[PDB]
């Protein structure tokens, strides 16, 4: 991987692995989401940021960036053995937080095969308290971001910024008692953000997966699932097929995530 000529974005190529593909012999959305995370980490490392991407003031004040929203749209899933090229960049969104965007391309054709956008908010890693971005922190990372806006989803009033409602009981479908194993944790022993995508998808009926391709997934992150927590995944059809999703703790029913998926007939 490498920073582009201007040093304001980063590119990396990936050959899709045998274990990374599903029943259609193309990369799963969880493989795509792991590749997005990987290119994001390699971009942070290439410009001086460390197991977290933090500025100097963030380390001093015990602050971390945490995902608030992930939105991904795939037009073509790369096949096993194919080379996919991913470009990523960060943008400041004033004191609300930061945004990390991605464009996916087929390496042979140069054609855009997917795009993603993610909203990140600042939080104290000890008290878990959300904060707005201080001027000192904002000034420490702005020189690594494009100054003029660069958006993976430019269109005014597009899918990436739509408000998601809370699924009401009874859910049409459910997958209960989901628990993370050690492979679901990252190097800091936190549940990987991609695991939540998998858990959301667990309550989609197998018949939908067998006859449809996932086109869009928007996921809100409200609370983290601890290593010893148990989760219930709920799905209701709102419609192409569209679904409304909810992940909550199995016991008290505390919300951890909410989302929507859009699927196209194969």
Q: Is 260 a binder of its own copies (CB under 8 A)?
A: no
| 193 is a catalytic site residue | no
From residue 156, give the alpha-carbon distance in Å to each of 120, 142, 151. Answer: 21, 24, 11
Q: Which stretch binds its own copies (CB under 8 A): 3-11, 94-102, 172-180, 257-265?
A: 172-180
Contact 50, 44 (CB under 8 A): yes
Q: Which stretch binds its own copies (CB under 8 A): 20-28, 139-147, 160-168, 252-260?
A: 20-28
Q: Indicate which single residue of 18, 127, 157, 239 sits in contact with its own copies (rule: CB under 8 A).
A: 18
Q: For residue 201, is it left (φ>0), alpha (ψ between -120 and 50) or beta?
A: alpha
| 190 is a catalytic site residue | yes
Residues in contact with ligand YZK by CB under 6 A are 43-44, 47, 49, 53, 55, 90, 98, 141, 144-145
Q: Is 146 a binder of its own copies (CB under 8 A)?
A: no
Q: How far is the CB of 239 from ligand YZK (least distance, A)?
A: 37
Q: Is 189 a binder of its own copies (CB under 8 A)?
A: yes
Q: Indicate which single residue of 3, 161, 164, 209 sits in contact with its own copies (rule: CB under 8 A).
A: 209
* Beta strands per DSSP E along 75-139: 83-93, 97-106, 112-124, 130-131
The torsion of the CA quartet 89, 132, 224, 165, rounded to 10 degrees, works out to -90
Q: How far is the CB of 51 from its own copies (least distance, A)?
A: 7
Q: Determine which one of 190, 192, 193, 245 is catalytic.
A: 190
The nearer residue to its own copies, 146 or 198, going by C-beta atoms, is 198
Q: Indicate which single residue of 34, 92, 113, 160 sits in contact with its own copies (rule: CB under 8 A).
A: 34
Q: Which stretch binds its own copies (CB under 8 A): 142-150, 201-209, 246-254, 257-265?
A: 201-209
Question: Which residues sit opposite 153 in a β-bridge?
Answer: none
Q: Determine which one of 192, 225, 245, 257 is catalytic.
A: 225
Q: What are phi and psi of 134, to 5 degrees?
A: -70, 160
What angle in degrees, to the nearest 10, is found between the helix axes of 193-202 and 29-46?
170
User: Furthest-apart CA pair in the chain: how many Å?
Assistant: 53
The nearer residue to its own copies, 178 or 246, going by C-beta atoms, is 178
| 41 is a catalytic site residue | no
The nearer residue to its own copies, 22 or 146, going by C-beta atoms, is 22
Which residues have CB under 8 Å from 158's CB, separation 6+? Answer: none
- State the binding partner of 47 from ligand YZK, its own copies, none, CB within 5 to 8 A by kind: ligand YZK
Which residues have CB under 8 Å from 266's CB, separation 6+? Answer: 211, 212, 213
Helical spans, DSSP H, in the chain: 29-46, 56-60, 135-141, 193-202, 206-211
- Letters for 79-118 (x = contact with its own copies by CB under 8 A, - = none) are -xx-------------------------------------
Active site residues: 188, 190, 225
């Amino acid at each position: 991987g490498s920073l582009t000529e201007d040093g304001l974005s980063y590119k990396e190529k990936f050959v899709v692995r045998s274990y990374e593909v599903g029943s259609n012999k193309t990369a799963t959305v969880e493989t795509i989401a792991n590749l997005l995370q990987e290119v994001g980490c390699n971009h942070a490392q290439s410009v001086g940021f460390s197991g977290f991407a933090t500025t100097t003031t963030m380390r001093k004040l015990h602050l971390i960036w945490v995902t608030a929203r992930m939105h991904i749209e795939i037009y073509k899933y790369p096949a096993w053995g194919d080379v996919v090229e991913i470009e990523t960049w960060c943008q400041s969104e004033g004191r609300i937080g930061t945004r990390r965007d991605w464009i996916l391309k087929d390496s042979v054709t140069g054609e855009v095969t997917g795009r993603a956008t993610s909203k990140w908010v600042m939080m104290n890693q000890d008290t878990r308290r959300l904060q707005k971005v201080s001027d000192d922190v904002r000034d420490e990372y702005l020189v690594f971001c494009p100054q003029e806006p660069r958006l993976a989803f430019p269109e005014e009033n597009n899918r990436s910024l739509k408000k998601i409602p809370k699924l009401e009981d009874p859910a049409q479908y459910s997958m209960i008692g989901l628990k993370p194993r050690r492979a679901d944790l990252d190097m800091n022993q936190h549940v990987n953000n991609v695991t939540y995508i998998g858990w959301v998808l667990e309550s989609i009926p197998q018949e939908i997966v067998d006859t449809h391709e996932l086109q869009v997934i928007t996921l809100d992150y409200r609370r983290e699932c601890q290593q010893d927590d148990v989760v219930d995944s709920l799905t209701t059809t709102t419609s192409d097929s569209q679904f409304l999703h909810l992940l909550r703790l199995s016991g008290d029913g505390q919300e951890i995530n909410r989302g929507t998926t859009l699927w196209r007939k194969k």
